[PDB]
Design a protein around this nucleic acid. Structure first.
Ligand SMILES: [Mg+2]
Ligand SMILES: [Mg+2]
Ligand SMILES: [Mg+2]
Ligand SMILES: [Mg+2]
Ligand SMILES: [Mg+2]
Ligand SMILES: [Mg+2]
Ligand SMILES: [Mg+2]
Ligand SMILES: [Mg+2]
Ligand SMILES: [Mg+2]
Ligand SMILES: [Mg+2]
Ligand SMILES: [Mg+2]
Ligand SMILES: [Mg+2]
Ligand SMILES: [Mg+2]
Ligand SMILES: [Mg+2]
Ligand SMILES: [Mg+2]
Ligand SMILES: [Mg+2]
Ligand SMILES: [Mg+2]
Ligand SMILES: [Mg+2]
Ligand SMILES: [Mg+2]
Ligand SMILES: [Mg+2]
Ligand SMILES: [Mg+2]
Ligand SMILES: [Zn+2]
Lengths: 141, 142, 129, 90
RNA sequence: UGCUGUUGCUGUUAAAGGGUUCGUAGUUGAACUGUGGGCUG
RNA sequence: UGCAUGCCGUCCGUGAUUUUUUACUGUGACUAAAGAAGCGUGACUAAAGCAGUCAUGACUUGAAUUAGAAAGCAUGGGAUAACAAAGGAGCUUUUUAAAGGUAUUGGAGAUUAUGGAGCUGUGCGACAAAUGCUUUCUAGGAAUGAAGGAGGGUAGUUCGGGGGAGAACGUACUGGGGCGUCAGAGGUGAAAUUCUUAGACCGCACCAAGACGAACUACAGCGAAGGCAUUCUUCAAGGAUACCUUCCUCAAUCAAGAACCAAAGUGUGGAGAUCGAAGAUGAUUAGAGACCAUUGUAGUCCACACUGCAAACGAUGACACCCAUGAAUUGGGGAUAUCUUGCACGUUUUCUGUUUUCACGCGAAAGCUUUGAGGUUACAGUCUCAGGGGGGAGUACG
RNA sequence: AAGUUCACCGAUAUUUCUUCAAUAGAGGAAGCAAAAGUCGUAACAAGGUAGCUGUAGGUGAACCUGCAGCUGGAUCAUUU
RNA sequence: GGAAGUCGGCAAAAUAGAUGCGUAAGUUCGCAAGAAGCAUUGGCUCUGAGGGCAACACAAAUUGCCAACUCAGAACUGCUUACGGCGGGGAAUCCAACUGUAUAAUUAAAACAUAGGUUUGU
RNA sequence: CGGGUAAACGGCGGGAGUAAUAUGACUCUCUUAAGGUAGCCAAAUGCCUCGUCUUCCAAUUAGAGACGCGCAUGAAUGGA
């Protein structure tokens, strides 16, 4: 995490050069799309949908099997979340911290972290309003 | 890591130079008015005045002498200054209530030599050059 | 963060040449970097180089022959008319008998001698000698 | 517009009684006249009638305690202590 | 007089990095759509 | 006064149909002299001037040419860039048959059918389609990529003197009684103020209260900095690592503006063991208001509200790239000897952190050196703060 | 033509407010330049109580004392 | 003429309503403040603004009837400045913080009280 | 007889003499329970007294600002 703090970590996934299915995967593309929509109806977010297909279902890189990305499939079917996924998680974190701080008013370390999180929300909401993914008057609390 | 470099960063560079020019002691003196008011001359190279009395100023250590001077009241603004009288003798040529022409001492208001606090010099008395009298090329009038 | 890809690459080549290395790896690459290297190659200042594809900004491996003294970029990219070539030559080149200033013009990327012959101006990119 | 720069409720006193006594009394006056949270209802509905008496505006509850605020800081400590000691007993 | 520094200055100890962060105007900002070819000397 | 008239590409005006600038660069146009540059010229030379030269006059005499910021005008060139838009599910053509509903008739003004053309609902012929209808279970498959840039997710229910809350432990300093004893104890270089047969000091087991958390404890760990060390329970966070998860430029750094910030100090309530500014009393000393001894008020500790200063130091601003060798060490992960009965350890790689042995090189030197104070007169990666001989002075005024 | 009355432009004077620049003053402070009387020795050596920074109190005078910090220290180093 | 009177501006004079503009030092930020100061005001004849209830389609965004008073603007015309009622203002020193109480019949104050501070017994 | 206590009643001199024209930073002595500290002043508190300097007037035993040898100022008998 480099936007705030002193972290300089480099840990992530590395996508392969060869973008073809491994040829032992017999699932058709239309079955994978129906397979994505069913997981959404259960209540899972797109980042969790990809992991469930990767772990116990043989599908790495849904985009390589079906030419589309997971969020694009959900948007077509009307199952996209109202607020973008990363904004939803940041707002949830700020709410839990604010609930903690009314009981513990001397936790000055947590007050410092809340200022960092709220700045991140305003920066992120600024971008989504510009690319028209949010209403122009969204106005985080 | 000392200056900005952008292609559209002219405004920052202009403002930076303007504020840092004031730190130059010489530049500031020529662009303000406090020095001009302080200067007994109103920014001129010479001035005329009336001799009030003759005084002697002790030379600063490690020198030892009595430097002959006079105190003058300027005609243009009634300010009082102290002017050095150069050359051997040359004090007898100057009498009280005489008109003199005073000039600078060569360091633009700074004191010169072992004479403490003296920045002016006499060059003319009674409309006759002081050095001319010293060489006996002219006679003291009246 | 990294602001200029061309400046990063030219600094890497110059350091490896100063240390007496034979090969140098450059990352990341771009179209401007490749064109600059070809101007150097045409005048005999570097050997062959290879571009590797990785589905991102690729990498370049360059062979050095010991003839390069210094290469560097000019930032920002000042405009240069056809009457300003003499001024740039006297300011950043060791002499008037060797060394080149590289420009980008409407006719493409070229050295100052070729640009003057075709009567075109442009923006300064870098230099080498 | 604001109508006052930092006097607040104590503007009714004019220039009388001194700055520090006024500033000390203002803090308790604001609390004494505020609306406090009713945990039975879930709304901000408790008002003070007389010293120590707090009445809910909607539900018919009356509570004892505080004299200028609904709950004093010592009472919360007493509550947690009593609950833990009873938890040991039972 | 490269002692006003765009070309072109200094900032550990000589004068000079703000106690540490957040942040708006401002300045700066990664790669990609792109070898024309065939016949003579 | 017909005196007259005949023997395919373009030009020009007007309507219909839909879209690329700016910037840079090359030419060109339009731009008072005097002044500057300079072509010619033996005013006797020169500073000058524009004149003059040669055989009823000629030189069809000469007085050339250039540069002058920026903005404005026309045009051609597309590499580096700027502006604006968008945020990807608000996304077929052609040919015939039919039904329905102005201009030419001599010119001028009225009434009238027939047709053109568009508006549509029926059949027919021919050809495409960037995503298979002889299809799948009836608009839903055609979209640059995923930065050794940023954000988010999942896991070891990982890691740590990181933060907040609550219960409970540990000796020690001080005090108090309970049991004993009896002549001094304390303190110093040496003493004295001070305590003591009304029992001090010393000894044993306790009780009260307030602080603190030894040894383990280190060129170790955590935190933005200030800072952080007993155990158990509890609340919200933070970093690194692993990933063929998601997203697609969301970033770097800063006037204004905002939050935190050792100690001392200030206000209001608590607390008051220890130590201890002010003060008191002994000693040293020529003097001693000090250093030393015995004390002692504010303070030192807690809650809430202020203050915003430190040799707040690595006296070294933030982000990014390259860089020689061998160690060591903290956390996570990958591969393959020892010991206890899942843990620890051994060897070798790897990502992050944190250090030590004059690397090249740099520097006035001291010194710095993958961790720069290196890669700079061979001077240009990005942003930002400060300095310009010594004082007066961080003072005066606002 | 002189002259009457009204509106408009408006010099000039006085009064009131605002801004700029200069100016006297019993008494109280600061700095510098001297000369060199008077009294001590804070700093530089472990400078004879290591020094210095911030803050608070005291004091004929340099200064002394308490609290926290630094080495620019008089130690780069001892349950491996 | 304008405090020269007198221990002392005692007494008297003086200011004056309403509306617009404008307003210093100091300060516990509330004030000081009606600070200070400048201007207008009659009568008559007009003009404008401010209302009520009755008659999926969007200028009933209009027709009629009627009350009660205030404010603003204009023309013309006049003063002998003309009922009553109604603050004089400024710069400073001493004392007491303030509102209050208080010698019925010579003392209203700087005295007493007060909020605030501290100590004692239990 | 021993301790304690001044936001208990109260007290805060007897004084002297030395020093850089002045003067006293400087020294010596006498002496107490302790020897007036921060402040303030010819004050509703100063005898001498209509004190001395500046300001206010033509002229001020009055007013204000300064000074301090304070007959006899001064800290909850509360000081500013
Ligand atoms: Mg990415
Ligand atoms: Mg004991
Ligand atoms: Mg005992
Ligand atoms: Mg403290
Ligand atoms: Mg001693
Ligand atoms: Mg003690
Ligand atoms: Mg002496
Ligand atoms: Mg010493
Ligand atoms: Mg009069
Ligand atoms: Mg009189
Ligand atoms: Mg009289
Ligand atoms: Mg009267
Ligand atoms: Mg008035
Ligand atoms: Mg009263
Ligand atoms: Mg009253
Ligand atoms: Mg009476
Ligand atoms: Mg009476
Ligand atoms: Mg009273
Ligand atoms: Mg007096
Ligand atoms: Mg009088
Ligand atoms: Mg007086
Ligand atoms: Zn209720």
């Amino acid at each position: 995490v480099r936007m705030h703090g002193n972290g300089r970590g480099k840990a992530s996934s590395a996508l392969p050069y060869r973008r073809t299915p491994p040829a032992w995967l017999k699932i058709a593309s239309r079955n994978v799309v129906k397979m994505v929509c069913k997981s959404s109806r259960k209540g899972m977010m797109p980042s969790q949908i990809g992991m469930e297909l990767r772990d116990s279902m043989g599908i790495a890189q849904v985009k390589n099997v079906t030419g589309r990305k997971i969020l694009r499939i959900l948007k077509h079917n009307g199952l996209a979340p109202e607020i973008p996924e990363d904004l939803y998680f940041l707002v949830k974190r700020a709410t839990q911290m604010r609930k903690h701080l009314e009981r513990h008013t001397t936790d000055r370390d947590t007050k410092y972290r809340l200022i960092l999180v709220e700045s991140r929300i305003h920066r992120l909401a600024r971008y989504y309003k510009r690319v028209k993914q949010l209403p122009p008057t969204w106005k985080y609390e | 890591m000392t200056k900005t470099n952008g292609q559209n960063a002219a405004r920052k560079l202009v403002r930076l130079r303007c504020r840092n020019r004031w730190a130059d002691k010489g530049w500031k003196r020529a662009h303000t008015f406090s020095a001009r008011k302080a200067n007994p001359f109103g920014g001129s190279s010479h001035a005329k005045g009336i001799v009030l009395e003759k005084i002697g100023v002790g030379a600063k250590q490690p020198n030892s002498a009595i430097r002959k001077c006079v105190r003058v009241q300027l005609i243009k603004n009634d300010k009082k200054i102290i002017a050095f009288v150069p050359n051997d003798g040359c004090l007898h040529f100057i009498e009280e209530n005489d008109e003199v022409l005073v000039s600078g001492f060569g360091r633009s208001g700074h004191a010169v030599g072992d004479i403490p606090g003296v920045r002016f010099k006499i060059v003319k008395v009674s409309n006759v050059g002081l050095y001319a009298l010293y060489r006996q090329k002219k006679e003291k009038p009246r | 963060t990294m602001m200029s890809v061309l400046a990063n690459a030219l600094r890497t080549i110059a350091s490896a040449e100063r240390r007496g290395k034979r090969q140098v790896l450059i990352r990341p690459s771009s179209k401007v970097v490749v064109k600059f290297l070809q101007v150097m190659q045409k005048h005999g200042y570097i050997g062959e180089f290879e571009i590797i594809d990785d589905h991102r900004a690729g990498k370049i491996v360059v062979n050095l022959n010991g003839r390069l003294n210094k290469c560097g970029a000019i930032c920002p990219r000042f405009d240069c008319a056809t009457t300003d070539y003499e001024k740039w030559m006297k300011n950043i080149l060791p002499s008037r008998q060797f060394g080149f200033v590289v420009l980008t013009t409407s006719l493409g990327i070229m050295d100052h001698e070729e640009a003057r012959s075709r009567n075109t101006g442009g923006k300064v990119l870098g230099f080498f000698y | 517009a604001k109508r006052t720069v930092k006097m607040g409720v104590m503007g009714r006193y004019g220039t009388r009684y001194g700055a520090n006594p006024r500033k000390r009394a203002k803090k308790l006056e604001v609390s004494q006249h505020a609306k406090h949270f009713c945990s039975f209802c879930g709304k901000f509905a408790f008002r003070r009638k007389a010293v120590g008496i707090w009445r809910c505006d909607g539900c018919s509850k009356t509570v004892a305690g505080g004299a200028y605020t609904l709950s004093t800081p010592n009472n919360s400590t007493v509550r947690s202590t009593v609950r833990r000691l009873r938890e040991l007993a039972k």
